Design a protein around this nucleic acid. Structure first.
Ligand SMILES: [Mg+2]
Ligand SMILES: [Mg+2]
Ligand SMILES: [Mg+2]
Ligand SMILES: [Mg+2]
Ligand SMILES: [Mg+2]
Ligand SMILES: [Mg+2]
Ligand SMILES: [Mg+2]
Ligand SMILES: [Mg+2]
Ligand SMILES: [Mg+2]
Ligand SMILES: [Mg+2]
Ligand SMILES: [Mg+2]
Ligand SMILES: [Mg+2]
Ligand SMILES: [Zn+2]
Ligand SMILES: [Zn+2]
Lengths: 386, 94, 131, 150, 136, 87
RNA sequence: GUGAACAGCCUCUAGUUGAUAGAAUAAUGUAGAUAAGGGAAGUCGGCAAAAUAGAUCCGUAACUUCGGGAUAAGGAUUGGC
RNA sequence: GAAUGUUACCGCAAUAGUAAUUGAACUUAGUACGAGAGGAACAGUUCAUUCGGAUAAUUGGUUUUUGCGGCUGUCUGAUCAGGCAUUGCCGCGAAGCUACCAUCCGCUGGAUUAUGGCUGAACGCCUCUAAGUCAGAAUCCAUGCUAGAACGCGGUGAUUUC
RNA sequence: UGUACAACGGGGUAUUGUAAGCAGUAGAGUAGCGUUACGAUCUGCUGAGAUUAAGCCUUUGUUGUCUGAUUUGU
């Protein structure tokens, strides 16, 4: 008979199965639709999540109760040194779907990206792409033929890039390699662009800019095996119920004589792939800017890195992206930043961000000081300093 | 409201509150006032004749620098002797 | 964090502040108003037997007398001896509103302090006479 | 946007940090930290807690009255915006901070004078009081030097 | 946001679920107020309706005039002990929970409010703002 | 309320989208593309300065390795009867 | 020794050091705890926990077989020198 | 997780699942409409409810960091430094975890239902229907989102001297 | 056999709240002859001292380490 009181089900059936993601780098499942008359452009970028901090924004939002008023907001900092273009892949349309027809690599690759092709790098003879690089000799036949094949048959063109992980504070030396779709001119112009950009760097400010909505694709933080109460958000059973209260009391009271797929069960929590959308870029910071932590209202010459560095990350010494709010993944995880799949019609996508202040107090405690000069000036002369 | 209706309408038009400022120079209207400088609020230092007050403070500083406000041996002991005593005391404590 | 501190100094179990009690004792009119209160049914002792220093009602005059003869009351009396520690002290220790804080200290030492001391002397001798 | 000082320890209170308590007489108590807020709730005395600026000024650990400490005060009468006046104020703030730091250092130096004299007297008394240990030290010195010689 | 309220209301931490007793901050003769319903409350199984500062509730007088007693009336929450975030950048709280008696249009029954009134409630309700002596 | 998939709201959105929002998207695209070109030119100039210090038919097989591999694979599929398109 | 105390806690004489181990620190348990704001809205039912607690002084109703009820209830206090 | 040369990197997408919801507010406006009393909506904007997915800058909770300090009783002659009290107890406490007790984010193309039509017979009138055809619901199928067939597949690197 | 790796050390960044030792003429008083003796506590040297990656950041120092096992072919 019918359930007496209505309640919505616990959890979302479209995020199934709640299994560990197959890779630590979450896949981009859809790129923006290509417009051929537009100039050539990358559709995505790769970065590393460094941490969070706090800002003060001078908000312009007509019709809002906080119009012409200051708001304090959380932001996420992503460390984004330039990526290095190393290859190009062509894709053809078939009745079974998109098929990669051919791949062309650049003549010279760094050991940073060569490490991605090894499980035991220190023992290997490092022979990867050595015979391939010999195909660039004597007027480059083979290379030219495969570029001609891409031009003649490809309906989609993607470019193989990799991170420069040696510019981050990470202990990992092996770089991250990814395909990034080229949306822009014709197929021929896409291929010419890729061939021209082989072994060259693309910086994040030649892909994004401030006041733009982007999407964050990443694997969430893992939490191991989890019970139903916290994995699914179900209600705890009364105190000292026999055989536990972090359970669902009845997993089936009705006919099918099985456990339904729609019933909450204990299992893996976290380390899933997620694509969150519409995060506004608050700042595109440059790595050689001495005051990239400073605003027009705060005249302190300071960088973005908080005192003592980001906890478990280190210091920001490269270009960075500051997006408001939070993104999937924990600090130092590789994240993919994607351009919007559609033209956002909300006015927040039109707002221009004007930051009044960026928090650089220490995250390793209840940080009270923004700079070491400020801490020293407030405290005064110490016993060791005399 | 006519300006608003021709620009964006209600809830889309963003009015500039600085346009009615009565300042000495009209180019100063769209100027950002700084608020923080190295842990200090600019507003509670902002004052007319702060330049004269700073000058008086500097005269005080010069008077101290002339007076000598900013500027190993004992009776019965030389420098090597006090060093020897210090080393022996450190040895004893250790 | 601990249970003792939580259940004693929970916000819903807060007590009157020392600067407020200092202001209560500073003026004679406040002293007389707090000494002579209307018969209130919801206060202990029908609103009578009120110690101003501790901001506390007692059920009876004998309870008030035994309270005045105690280390708790003497502790509160010692606490109310100095400057009442406004936000001006913290601002001045930071180096801000220094002239304002110094003027306030001068006023306490010159006028408000000795008047409070005289009121406290008169209040103590009245409590001795009536108790 | 304004930097406040903690009601308990006078530390700077930046936006977002700490917590504010409003008393029924409309007085705001801003606290930089949970530590200071819990001390206030337990009703501890900031002038007796040694880690606070109120105590340090009360006990004379740092100079409290100086001509550099009078420039910063809450301005309740505004002045019209002037670009060059703002520029002069910004230069003056750095100059005042530099002079205040120099005078703070000098104050700590004057407070700590006599330390070397005390240390030397203590060392002399200890050396005078330990003749046997010094003899052991000399034997160790002579044996180590003879080992180096041979 | 309630009838008589002026504009939208952004989310505030909830401090007063049904069954709470707050003080009466006006001068209409009531001493405390017992919350029995919250206007604008949503619906979810097992979840208690709760009120924050600037909300309208239905309340009974437990202590005060017998004329005020045995009647269910609207009240507007002007103070709460649960800390809440201000968008300027501070979490804050009051000493007590407090409300004032109103009619369904949000007009004040009493003539004055003793103690501070939260800015959010004052800005939401113009009659509370008119009867307020202290706005934080 | 109107759902996210409500026709009249989506029609109003499309009318709004064809105008000022698409204008903003296009202008940002032009700015970013100019920055990308300048980035390439700057890399060329740096490499040039550094080197100053130092000084088509697609028919047939892709290569002989590809020829041997695909021929062997197709022969193996014929022999083991594992072809998707041939018997 | 503490303390009213053959209580609990720590120690001297004497006596043991036995009870399968090692490494890890998911869920669910068993045993024990803490929690903002609210304060029984939970539940068949305040079940369970929490709150109280030693001693000194002030004070203590109905009812009553006049013996009680009574540690009724309600208050002030407690270190060290 | 065996096996279809070995080993490695980048990918495709059959199939299965799928997700958002509701209320108010400004403007339209004191307008249409109305003797009056009253009193809308589309287009343009701003918040919130329920749900969902993350997240930890900040606030709060938590403490074997037994990190720092203190307290009772006893024991180590005292000081010092410590032990025990089934984590002894009290205050603070980073890190980690975590809360509508904290913050962020959650869309747009095709085909349709009722119904309103166009052209038009049946039936020399007529008729949205018979043939043909236009719109149109929170619906359907997709776009987007999750997994990826361990017996679905593609592209690419290296491929062994006792 | 190297922006190599590690163990320590250094510097930051955080946490607590002023170490041990010595001194004073600060200390309710009491005992003996203005003085000495006991004396909770207070003050100074001293934001001192302790801790700080175990899932914090960093590093021109010191000392070491870089080595075995097994299997795979169109
Ligand atoms: Mg932190
Ligand atoms: Mg229920
Ligand atoms: Mg609680
Ligand atoms: Mg009930
Ligand atoms: Mg019930
Ligand atoms: Mg009884
Ligand atoms: Mg499908
Ligand atoms: Mg509309
Ligand atoms: Mg959650
Ligand atoms: Mg002990
Ligand atoms: Mg017709
Ligand atoms: Mg597979
Ligand atoms: Zn008292
Ligand atoms: Zn503080």
């Amino acid at each position: 008979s019918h359930r007496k009181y209505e309640a919505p089900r616990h959890g979302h059936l479209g995020f199934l199965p709640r299994k560990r993601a197959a890779s630590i780098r979450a896949r981009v499942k859809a790129f923006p639709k290509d417009d051929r008359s537009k100039p050539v452009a990358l559709t995505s970028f790769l970065g590393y999540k460094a941490g969070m901090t706090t800002i003060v924004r001078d908000l312009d939002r007509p019709g809002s109760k906080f119009h012409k008023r200051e708001v304090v907001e959380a932001v996420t900092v992503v460390d984004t040194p330039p990526v290095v273009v190393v290859g190009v892949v062509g894709y053809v349309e078939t009745p079974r779907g998109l098929r990669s027809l051919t791949t062309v690599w650049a003549e010279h690759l760094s050991d940073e990206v060569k490490r991605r092709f090894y499980k035991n790098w220190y023992k290997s003879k490092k022979k990867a792409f050595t015979k391939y690089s010999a195909k660039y000799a004597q007027d480059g036949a083979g290379i030219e033929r495969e570029l001609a094949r891409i031009k003649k048959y490809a309906s989609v063109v993607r470019v193989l890039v990799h991170t420069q992980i040696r510019k981050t504070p990470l202990a990992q030396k092996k770089a991250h390699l990814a395909e990034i779709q080229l949306n822009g001119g014709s197929i021929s112009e896409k291929v010419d662009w890729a061939r021209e950009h082989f072994e060259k760097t693309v910086a994040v400010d030649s892909v994004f800019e401030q006041n733009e909505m982007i999407d964050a694709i990443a694997v969430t933080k893992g939490h191991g095996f989890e019970g139903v109460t916290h994995r699914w958000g179900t209600k705890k059973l009364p105190r000292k119920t026999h055989r536990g209260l972090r359970k669902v009391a009845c997993i089936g009271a009705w006919h099918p004589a099985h456990v339904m797929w729609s019933v909450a069960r204990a299992g893996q929590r976290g380390y899933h792939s997620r694509t969150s959308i519409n995060h506004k870029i608050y700042r595109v910071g440059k790595g050689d800017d001495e005051a990239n932590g400073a605003t027009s209202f705060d005249r302190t010459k300071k960088t973005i890195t908080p005192m003592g560095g980001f906890v478990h990350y280190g210091e920001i010494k490269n270009d960075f992206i500051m997006v408001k709010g939070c993104i999937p993944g924990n600090r130092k995880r590789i994240v993919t930043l994607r351009k919007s799949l559609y033209t956002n019609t909300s006015r927040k996508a039109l707002e221009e961000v004007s930051l009044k202040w960026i928090d650089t107090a220490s995250k390793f405690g209840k940080g009270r000081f923004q700079t070491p000069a400020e801490k020293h000036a407030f405290m005064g002369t110490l016993k060791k300093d005399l | 409201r006519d300006i608003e209706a021709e620009n964006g309408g209600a809830g889309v038009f963003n009015v500039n509150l600085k346009d009615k400022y009565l300042l000495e120079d009209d180019e100063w209207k769209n100027d950002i006032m700084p608020e923080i400088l190295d842990g200090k609020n600019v507003y509670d230092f902002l004052d007319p004749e702060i330049a004269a007050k700073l000058q008086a403070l500097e005269e005080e500083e010069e008077k101290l620098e002339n007076e000598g406000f900013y500027n190993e041996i004992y009776d019965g002991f030389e420098a090597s002797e006090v060093d020897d005593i210090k080393e022996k005391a450190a040895w004893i404590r250790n | 964090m601990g249970r003792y501190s939580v259940k004693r100094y929970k916000t819903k179990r807060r007590t009157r502040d020392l600067d407020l009690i200092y202001n209560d004792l500073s003026t004679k009119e406040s002293v007389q108003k707090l000494l002579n209160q209307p018969l209130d049914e919801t206060k202990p002792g029908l609103g009578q037997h009120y110690c101003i220093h501790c901001a506390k009602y007692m059920e009876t005059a004998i309870a008030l007398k035994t309270h005045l003869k105690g280390k708790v009351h003497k502790r509160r009396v010692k606490e109310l001896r100095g400057v009442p520690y406004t936000q001006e002290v913290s601002d001045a220790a930071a180096g801000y509103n220094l002239n304002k804080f110094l003027n306030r200290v001068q006023e306490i030492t010159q006028s408000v302090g000795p008047e409070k001391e005289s009121n406290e002397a008169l209040l103590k001798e009245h409590l001795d006479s009536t108790l | 946007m304004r930097i406040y000082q903690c009601h308990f320890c006078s530390s700077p209170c930046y936006p977002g940090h700490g917590i504010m308590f409003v008393r029924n007489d409309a007085k705001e108590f801003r606290f930089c930290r949970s530590k200071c807020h819990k001390a206030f709730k337990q009703r501890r005395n900031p002038r007796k807690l040694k880690w606070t600026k109120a105590f340090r000024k009360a006990a004379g650990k740092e100079l409290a009255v100086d001509s550099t400490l009078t420039f910063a005060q809450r301005r309740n009468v505004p002045v019209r915006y002037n670009r060059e006046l703002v520029a002069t104020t910004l230069k003056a703030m750095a100059r005042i901070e530099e002079i205040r730091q120099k005078r703070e250092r000098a104050f700590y130096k004057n407070r700590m004078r006599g330390n070397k004299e005390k240390d030397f007297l203590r060392d002399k008394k200890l050396v005078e009081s330990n003749p046997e240990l010094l003899r052991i030290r000399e034997v160790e010195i002579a044996r180590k030097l003879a080992k180096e010689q041979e | 946001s309630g009838n008589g309220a002026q504009g939208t209301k952004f989310r505030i931490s909830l401090g007063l679920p049904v069954g709470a007793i707050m003080n009466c901050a006006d001068n209409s003769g009531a001493r405390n107020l017992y919350i029995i319903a919250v206007k604008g409350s949503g619906s979810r199984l097992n979840r208690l309706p709760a009120a924050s500062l600037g909300d309208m509730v239905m309340a009974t007088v437990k202590k005060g005039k017998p004329e005020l007693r045995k009647k269910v009336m609207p009240a507007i929450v002007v103070r709460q002990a649960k800390s809440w975030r201000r968008r300027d950048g501070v979490f804050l709280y009051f000493e007590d929970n407090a409300g004032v008696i109103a009619n369904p249009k949000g007009e004040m029954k009493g003539s004055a409010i003793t103690g501070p009134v939260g800015k959010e409630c004052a800005d939401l309700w113009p009659r509370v703002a008119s009867n307020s002596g202290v706005v934080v | 309320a109107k759902s996210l998939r409500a026709s009249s709201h989506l029609n109003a959105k499309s009318v709004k989208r064809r105008g000022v929002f698409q204008k903003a998207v296009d202008a940002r695209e032009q700015r970013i593309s100019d920055k990308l070109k300048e980035d390439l030119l700057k890399q060329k100039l740096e490499d040039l300065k550094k080197k100053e210090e130092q000084g088509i038919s697609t028919s047939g097989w892709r290569d002989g390795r590809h020829h041997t591999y695909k021929k062997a694979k197709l022969m193996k599929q014929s022999k083991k009867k594992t072809s998707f398109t041939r018997f």
